[PDB]
DNA sequence: TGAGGAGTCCAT
DNA sequence: GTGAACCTGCAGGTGAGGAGTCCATG
DNA sequence: ATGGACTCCTCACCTGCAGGTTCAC
DNA sequence: AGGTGAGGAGTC
């Protein structure tokens, strides 16, 4: 792939203005006038618009401590299941975690009814009747939230830590936890009543290239204060 | 170069008149260089150097006549390289030193001479003149070596007549052996290799005494020495020790006298080898067993002091398997904790090896000087002659023969000596009782990895570091030589690229003359009478550019105005993209601007610009765009300009440099030349003849007298870059680098631009794989690179002017990059030349700036650095003095620190030989400080920035009522034991306050009040050292009796296992002992604690240990006498 | 040092006309084959093996002619004696024929020279000294072991009674 | 026996591999240009009247 | 007193 | 009276950024 | 030798401080 | 097997 930025301003300069996506389009215009004169014009639309919510930064800043707070009193484990076990990635992680003020823990083996973060590799590398680490770990334990990551997303291009990373992967715990206690924890917002929900779910099978097969579609609705899946 | 030539003469005439006065005697003579870096200027003070013996006179007469000029002219001799010395001796000289020594008969010899004649004689082009270089080479090694073995001891053809000028044209270095010649020229790489005469290869190094040594340009010669050093070679550790260990258990001297005293020398190695033998198991090979193991392999970094690096992620361990009968280097455990290793460590196994090995090297020179004492005057039997540069290579035959060592003669050829020239200096041991300093002690790197072919061994490879720069020049001082070093930077502050002026003023002494201020003035009243600008009407113009893109973006555009933007201009017709666009902008907006007052202003003609990169083909580009100005700005004003593109040294000698001159005197415009730093250093005299038909008026003339000879000009208009990468870098091969890299750390760190922490951070990533732009950045933030930039600037402005005629205008431009750092100077502007003193006073109007001494900084620094130091090495001592056997010079080693500090607790001056047990504090007589012994080293804080810590001072040892006693005073006043603290800018460093001090402070105070009262003391007998203080004995008591001591109110954590295991260990060998713990300076109000074999305090009559509150109170010093009587009672009858 | 090296020699070719740089182009040519067949050898021993196929092939066949027989292209070779005696290279080592001579057929045309130039290749063969030789031997086999393993399995009764 | 990383399986392979075993164990190293120089010629014989001395 | 000269490979 | 939140819209971004040379080795 | 339409692929983001206003006690 | 969106390459 390759792009070009769609506008630049930088230093208020008229030449790095006119080497972007709207730049161009400034140009073209100023072409047909000089091969057309004014028989051709080409006019745009405006969409009308009265209700606009410009979002400021600390609104954002005060969602996510919140946010945390509801992940601090739990229990979170880091494990590692590669082969050539190299790096420390579970330490650089647990550092990550702990700047939060959450406190983790590791383990060599993935504990029962606790939030558990996996470290494992690529998932092509595997034979295929080989029993890949993620996939035992998980059917075994049906009563328990995973996550997983790569161990080479951890560093950067300068080889600082990723901070962006180990956010996401705290938030995403929290989405999954919550769906497994069907009971919202932080405060959403309310939505129209009496609806249901249906989501059609493509097979996983390699087979399912047809067109029209039908497809599973799965339904969500909310009783009371439980959701029923 | 007339002073010094003048200086050579003047000792050639004294060494004649001393000639003609001494029959009565006979000696030898005075031997004279004439050293520097470049081949050319060798040459060229050769040539002054005759011509002054021939146009040289007195009283309007010549001073000398022609016969005598003759004599002067034949003792000068030239040493070039060996393919050069072959090229210049004509066929009939080799012809008839070829049927001399009747090596016409080979085979091989003539058909290599056929060749090698053949080629020179069609030797035009620059094809064959390469093979021609290489070919002589070998040509003339071979040669050689077969003469020399024809001369040895038999069948030695005699030379006399013709012969001789053959034999000296092709070997100069004959002239000097006969007695010919005693003055010498050569380049300083051909100076530390030697020369060839017919006997063996000359080592200038080796002897020294009584000889004088002029070198140019002194500070450059720091890096030639360097790049010498890096270039030795790796050595397999293992194999080393198996061969040496093998050989050094059967084979034995001859018992003759010529042998005497060297048989003594070789017995304490001949017993640690063995030891290491037997601790290792090195009847075993070795390998790795492991994953992560097997896949990259190990490196180990260490300093020999205190700074060790390693390449791993878990400390790694060795083993010996009896059933697979091999040696295993496995990971252990690899979890935290679990069970420390108790088995060994890979560490411990080469810093061990390399002391060995370091070991068998310098005995075999004290070997060899023995060796020449016995054989010159104790046998005489043999008519022999010769010096200790004669009985050199007999008397390593002889002992490697004997000892069936035969592998080692390269190694100990490559530094050998009465003793070094290639190992350590000064102090020469590494201990706290002996002067310490980087600059001989030098770096070891290791590496580990597979055997070539074999799939189950594996090999340490190890290079080294023994000396620095610095060190070599030190040595050469002290050997007995003088050296002259001339230059006009030669006393600059930085460390990387000059001289550590430092060490050599501790080390030397009153050996570094240096002039006075009666004799600066007069050499600054000489050089105002040759070059006077307050008056004639010389004015210097100064001015500061900085970048502007406005100036750029139009002339893009006129340079090809069908174009839209500018940036595609400049990446599209231009070569850049789009990374490298600010940089090029902010130097060519600064370029051109320059260009265009110099093309204004009306009486210029001549003016140069430095860069730091090449103008050459690879940029044609940019070139046409600056040629295309250059035309614009010649419309606007009147005034004819030409360019001068590609000027490097290659084109210097392929072009020449006298076509500028030519085109200034025999053609009316303005020049414009384009240059760089390195360029303008080896390419000198940028002068043109004047005409003044030609030029106008302003050729003011600034001498106070007329001036001789043709009439000459100069520069009259400089441009001024900021310089470009200034760390050191190697090219002959990957070592060389790495080696490199880390002396200059350890020179930072030495000298105090740099913290430990920082020092060992910036090591760990040179380890690891490092880019060569970070460790830039790392440099950037020193105190040194200031110092270097405005070195080059000097220099620069400083070889712009040889002549005493000047226009009236001089135009200077400069960077606006250079501002502050000028604007930074503060030295004394005695010695300046005109053009710096403009450029400092120009940048010293702006502002203000606020100036921290690098003293500040360097105090702090090196503080941490000897208390860093402190603590390794006591534990390391401490470790070595609890082995089963204790050695002998480990006890003395103990003594004497502690005898030092108490005799002189803070010194005046700055120490010599206990030098890393003394900081430096701002304020005479205490310091604060506030960290952990026993935690992390790099961690300490002192002085102001800890304004809360403890304190370092004499009232926290209570030595005022310590010696306060009556039966105390007088031991401390006997033995020179000070009770006070002499207020002095030294003081004793945390680590030697706490744990050595406090103790022997206490201890022997224990000596005088239980000895004046009976008791009598003696000493630990070599087994339970440092397990306990002394032994006592009285009134014939038996039990042996054993005492150990806190000092004051001291509380150790040892109550636990520990003190049983020591009571315990002694009593299963001496058998039942009594145990006497007492302290001092406490309370004397307590009872007495008598304390069974564990800590459950048993009844007074049934207990093995005695415990004692205090016997000297702290109120007024009083006695326990009560104490003392219990102690009787209790060790008596009972 | 090879850049160096074959920039002179490949100047030095072009020049060959007279009857003097052919000495000693003669002789510099065969220094500069060693060394760099040296440097082939160490950089394909294990490590880093880096494959042929196609133009680099050719090249390799070409530099190399002893590789054509190692892979299975050609199995006929005409040679003299001496370099017969001696042996030719391939990529990986030296192959020497008076080791593996089970099968194959040899015509030897003049068999009574043969008998001089044997001889001749006999007598250049360097000497060696005996003390210390004898003395090394001694001191190396007297507390030296090898490894316990099955790949070394009674190899070690073979040096019992030395 | 002994599967493992396999190429060539001849004398010629092992060859130079287990000289350098037995000539790094023993320590040695010295003698490895005369044992290379001494299994090309010398190294057809002990053939039990082709050559022994008795 | 005894006999009487050229011709060759290959790695250093 | 004041000092904590609270609320726009102008800057600046990984490090820093190259020639030139002596001598021995088959 | 041609044109315009679905499906799968890769790549970037996830600011920061300084100056004027304002309550909150 | 971080995520959600916005968007450039390879073919019936």
């Given at each position: ?10 230093k208020?300069?008229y ?14 215009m100023?072409d047909?006038?000089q ?13 009308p618009?009265?209700?606009?919510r ?10 996510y401590?919140?946010?945390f707070?509801?992940?601090?009193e739990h229990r979170l484990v880091?494990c590692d299941l590669?082969?050539?076990?190299d790096?420390?990635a579970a330490l650089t ?20 009814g ?20 993620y996939?035992?770990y ?5 009563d ?5 990551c ?29 769906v ?7 405060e959403?917002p ?9 989501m ?5 099978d390699?087979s399912?290239?047809?067109r ?15 959701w029923?899946? | 170069t ?6 050579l003469?003047?000792?050639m005439?004294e060494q ?12 030898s ?6 050293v520097t870096?470049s081949?050319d200027n060798?040459?060229?003070?050769k040539?002054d150097?005759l ?5 040289q006179?007195?009283?309007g007469?010549?001073?000398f006549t022609l ?14 390289n ?5 090229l210049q001796?004509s ?6 030193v ?5 090596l016409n008969?080979?085979?091989?010899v003539?058909?290599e001479?056929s ?10 082009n ?10 002589a ?39 000097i ?8 020229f050569?380049?300083?790489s051909?100076?530390?290799?030697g020369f060839?005469?017919?006997?063996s290869?000359?080592?200038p190094?080796?002897?020294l005494?009584?000889?004088?040594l002029?070198?140019?340009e002194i ?6 020495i ?9 050595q ?5 020790i198996?061969?040496?260990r093998?050989?050094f ?8 006298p ?14 640690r ?14 390998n ?6 097997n ?11 205190f700074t060790?690096?390693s390449s ?5 361990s ?6 697979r009968?091999?040696?295993?280097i496995?990971?252990?455990?690899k ?5 420390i290793e108790?088995?060994?460590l ?9 002391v060995?090995?370091?070991?068998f ?5 004290k ?11 104790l046998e ?10 004669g009985?050199?290579?007999?008397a390593v ?5 004997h000892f069936?060592?035969?592998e ?5 050829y490559?530094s050998?000596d ?6 350590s ?8 009782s002996?002067?310490?300093?980087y600059?001989?002690t ?8 597979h ?5 189950d061994?594996?090999?340490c490879?190890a290079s080294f ?6 060190g ?5 001082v002290?050997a ?9 930077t030669?006393r ?9 002026f430092?060490?050599?003023?501790e080390?030397?002494?009153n050996k ?9 003035q007069?050499?600054?009243?000489y ?8 008056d ?5 113009t100064?001015?500061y ?11 893009l555009?006129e340079?090809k ?6 940036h595609?201009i ?8 789009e990374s ?11 370029l ?6 110099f ?19 690879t ?5 046409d765009?600056i ?9 606007e004003?009147?005034?004819?300009t030409?360019?001068?593109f ?6 210097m ?10 085109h200034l005197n025999?053609?009316?415009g303005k ?7 390195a ?6 005299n ?17 001498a ?6 043709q ?5 009259d208009?400089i ?10 870098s ?16 350890l020179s930072?760190?030495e000298?105090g631009?740099?913290?430990p922490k920082?020092?060992?951070n ?6 690891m ?6 460790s ?7 105190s040194?690179?200031?110092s ?6 000097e ?5 712009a002017g040889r002549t005493?005629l000047k ?5 200077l ?9 000028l604007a930074?100077?503060?030295?004394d502007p005695?010695?300046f ?19 921290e001494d690098?003293?500040v900084?360097?105090?702090?620094n ?8 402190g603590?390794?090495?006591?534990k ?11 050695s002998?010079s480990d ?11 108490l ?8 120490p ?7 900081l430096?504090?701002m304020?005479?007589?205490y ?9 992390d ?6 002085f102001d920035?800890?304004?809360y810590?403890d ?12 010696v306060?006693?009556q039966?105390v ?9 000070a009770?006070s603290?002499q207020?002095?800018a ?17 201890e ?5 009040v ?8 003696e000493?630990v ?25 806190k000092?004051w109110?001291?509380?150790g ?11 315990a260990?002694v009593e299963?060998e001496?058998?039942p002992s009594?145990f006497i ?13 008598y304390?069974?074999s564990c800590?459950v305090?048993?009844?007074?009559q049934?207990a093995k240990?005695?415990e004692?509150?205090?016997l ?5 010093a ?10 009787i009672?209790?060790?008596?009858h009972?």
């Amino acid at each position: 792939k390759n792009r070009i930025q769609a506008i630049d301003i930088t230093k208020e300069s008229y030449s790095g203005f006119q080497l972007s996506k709207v730049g161009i389009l400034e140009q073209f215009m100023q072409d047909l006038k000089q091969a057309y004169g004014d028989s051709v014009s080409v006019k745009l639309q405006r969409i009308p618009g009265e209700k606009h919510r410009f979002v400021s930064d600390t609104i954002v800043k005060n969602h996510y401590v919140g946010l945390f707070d509801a992940l601090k009193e739990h229990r979170l484990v880091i494990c590692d299941l590669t082969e050539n076990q190299d790096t420390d990635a579970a330490l650089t992680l647990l550092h990550g975690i702990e700047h939060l003020d959450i406190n983790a823990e590791i383990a060599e083996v993935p504990i029962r009814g606790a939030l558990n973060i996996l470290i494992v590799g690529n998932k092509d590398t595997y034979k295929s009747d080989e029993e890949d680490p993620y996939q035992v770990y998980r059917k075994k334990y049906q009563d328990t939230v995973f996550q997983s990551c790569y161990p080479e997303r951890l560093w950067n291009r300068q080889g600082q830590p990723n901070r962006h990373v180990v956010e996401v992967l705290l938030k995403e715990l929290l989405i999954k936890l919550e769906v497994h206690t069907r009971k919202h924890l932080i405060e959403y917002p309310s939505g129209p009543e009496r609806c249901v929900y249906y989501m059609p779910q493509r097979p996983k099978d390699e087979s399912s290239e047809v067109r029209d097969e039908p497809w599973p579609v799965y339904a969500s609705k909310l009783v009371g204060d439980e959701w029923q899946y | 170069t007339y002073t010094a030539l003048n200086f050579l003469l003047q000792q050639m005439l004294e060494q004649v008149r001393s000639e003609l006065k001494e029959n009565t005697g006979k000696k030898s003579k005075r031997l004279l260089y004439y050293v520097t870096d470049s081949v050319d200027n060798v040459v060229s003070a050769k040539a002054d150097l005759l011509k002054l013996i021939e146009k040289q006179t007195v009283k309007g007469e010549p001073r000398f006549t022609l016969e005598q000029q003759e004599y002067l002219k034949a003792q000068i001799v030239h040493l070039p390289n060996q393919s050069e010395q072959l090229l210049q001796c004509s066929d009939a000289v080799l012809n008839d030193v070829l049927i001399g020594f009747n090596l016409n008969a080979e085979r091989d010899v003539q058909a290599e001479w056929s060749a090698i004649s053949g080629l020179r004689r069609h030797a035009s082009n620059p094809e064959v003149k390469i093979s021609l270089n290489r070919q002589a080479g070998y040509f003339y090694r071979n040669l050689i070596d077969r003469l020399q073995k024809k001369q040895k001891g038999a069948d030695r053809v005699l030379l006399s007549g013709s012969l001789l000028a053959s034999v000296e044209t092709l070997l100069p270095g004959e002239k000097i052996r006969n007695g010919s010649a005693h003055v010498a020229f050569l380049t300083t790489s051909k100076f530390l290799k030697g020369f060839h005469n017919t006997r063996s290869r000359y080592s200038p190094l080796r002897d020294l005494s009584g000889a004088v040594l002029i070198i140019d340009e002194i500070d450059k010669q720091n890096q030639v020495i360097l790049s010498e050093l890096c270039k030795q070679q790796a050595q397999d550790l293992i194999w080393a020790i198996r061969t040496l260990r093998a050989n050094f258990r059967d084979h034995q001297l001859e018992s003759s006298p010529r042998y005497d005293k060297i048989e003594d020398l070789f017995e304490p190695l001949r017993e640690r080898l063995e030891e290491f033998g037997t601790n290792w198991n090195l009847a075993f090979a070795f390998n790795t067993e492991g994953a992560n193991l097997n896949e990259r392999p190990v490196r180990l970094f260490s300093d020999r002091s205190f700074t060790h690096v390693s390449s791993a992620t878990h400390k790694l361990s060795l083993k010996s398997d009896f059933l697979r009968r091999k040696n295993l280097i496995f990971s252990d455990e690899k979890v935290e904790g679990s069970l420390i290793e108790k088995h060994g460590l890979l560490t411990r196994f080469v810093n061990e090896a390399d002391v060995i090995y370091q070991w068998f090297l310098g005995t075999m020179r004290k070997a060899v000087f023995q060796y020449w004492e016995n054989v010159r005057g104790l046998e005489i039997e043999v008519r022999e002659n010769r010096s200790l540069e004669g009985t050199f290579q007999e008397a390593v035959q002889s002992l490697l023969t004997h000892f069936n060592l035969q592998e080692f003669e390269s190694a100990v050829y490559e530094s050998f000596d009465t003793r070094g020239l290639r190992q350590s200096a000064g102090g020469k041991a590494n201990k706290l009782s002996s002067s310490k300093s980087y600059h001989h002690t030098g770096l070891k790197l290791v590496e580990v990895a597979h055997n070539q072919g074999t799939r189950d061994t594996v090999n340490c490879k190890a290079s080294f570091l023994n000396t620095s720069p610095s060190g070599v020049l030190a040595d050469m001082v002290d050997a007995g030589a003088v050296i002259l070093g001339i230059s006009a930077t030669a006393r600059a502050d930085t460390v990387i690229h000059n001289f550590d002026f430092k060490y050599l003023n501790e080390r030397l002494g009153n050996k570094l003359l240096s002039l006075s201020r009666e004799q600066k003035q007069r050499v600054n009243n000489y050089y105002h009478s040759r070059r006077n600008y307050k008056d004639n009407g010389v004015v210097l113009t100064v001015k500061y550019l900085n970048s502007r893109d406005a100036f750029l973006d139009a002339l893009l555009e006129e340079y090809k105005p069908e174009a839209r933007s500018s940036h595609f201009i400049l990446n599209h017709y231009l070569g850049i993209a789009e990374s490298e666009q600010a940089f090029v902008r902010s130097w060519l907006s600064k370029l051109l601007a320059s260009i265009k007052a110099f093309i204004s202003s009306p009486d210029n003609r001549y003016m140069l610009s430095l860069l730091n990169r090449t103008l050459d083909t690879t940029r044609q580009n940019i070139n046409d765009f600056i040629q295309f100005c250059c035309d614009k700005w010649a419309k606007e004003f009147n005034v004819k300009t030409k360019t001068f593109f590609g000027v490097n040294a290659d084109w210097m000698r392929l072009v020449g440099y006298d076509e500028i001159s030519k085109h200034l005197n025999t053609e009316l415009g303005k020049v414009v030349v384009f240059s760089t730093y390195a360029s303008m250093g080896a390419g000198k005299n940028p002068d043109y003849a004047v005409n003044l038909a030609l030029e106008g008026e302003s050729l003011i003339s600034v001498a106070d007298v007329t001036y001789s000879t043709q009439l000459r000009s100069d520069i009259d208009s400089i441009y001024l870059e900021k310089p470009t990468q200034l760390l050191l870098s190697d090219d002959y091969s990957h070592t060389a680098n790495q080696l490199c890299q880390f002396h200059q750390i350890l020179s930072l760190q030495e000298n105090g631009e740099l913290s430990p922490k920082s020092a060992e951070n910036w090591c760990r990533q040179q380890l690891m794989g490092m880019s060569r732009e970070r460790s830039l950045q790392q440099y950037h933030q020193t105190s040194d690179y200031q110092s270097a930039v405005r070195k080059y600037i000097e220099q620069a402005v400083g070889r712009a002017g040889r002549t005493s005629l000047k226009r009236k205008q001089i135009l200077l431009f400069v960077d606006s990059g250079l501002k502050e750092i000028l604007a930074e100077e503060s030295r004394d502007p005695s010695l300046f030349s005109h053009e710096y003193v403009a450029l400092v006073n120009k940048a010293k109007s702006a502002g203000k700036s606020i100036v921290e001494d690098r003293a500040v900084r360097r105090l702090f620094n090196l503080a941490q650095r000897n208390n860093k130091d402190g603590m390794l090495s006591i534990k390391a001592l401490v470790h070595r003095l609890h082995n089963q056997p204790a050695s002998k010079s480990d006890i003395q080693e103990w003594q004497d620190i502690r005898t030092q500090l108490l005799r002189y607790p803070t010194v005046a001056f700055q120490p010599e030989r206990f030098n890393r047990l003394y900081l430096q504090s701002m304020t005479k007589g205490y310091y604060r400080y506030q960290g952990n012994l026993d935690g992390d080293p790099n961690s300490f804080e002192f002085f102001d920035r800890v304004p809360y810590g403890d304190m370092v001072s004499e009232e926290d040892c209570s030595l005022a009522t310590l010696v306060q006693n009556q039966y105390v005073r007088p031991w401390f006043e006997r033995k020179g034991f000070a009770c006070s603290w002499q207020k002095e800018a030294n003081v004793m460093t945390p680590i030697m306050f706490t744990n050595i001090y406090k103790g022997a402070l206490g201890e022997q105070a224990v000596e005088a009040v239980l000895t004046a009262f009976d008791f009598t003391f003696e000493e630990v007998p070599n087994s339970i050292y440092e397990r306990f203080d002394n032994r006592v004995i009285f009134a014939g008591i038996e039990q042996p009796i054993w005492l150990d001591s806190k000092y004051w109110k001291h509380e150790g954590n040892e109550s636990s296992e520990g003190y049983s295991s020591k009571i315990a260990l002694v009593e299963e060998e001496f058998g039942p002992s009594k145990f006497i713990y007492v302290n001092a300076l406490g309370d004397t109000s307590k009872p007495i604690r008598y304390l069974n074999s564990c800590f459950v305090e048993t009844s007074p009559q049934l207990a093995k240990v005695i415990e004692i509150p205090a016997l000297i109170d702290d109120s007024n010093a009083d006695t326990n006498r009560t104490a003392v009587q219990e102690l009787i009672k209790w060790l008596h009858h009972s």
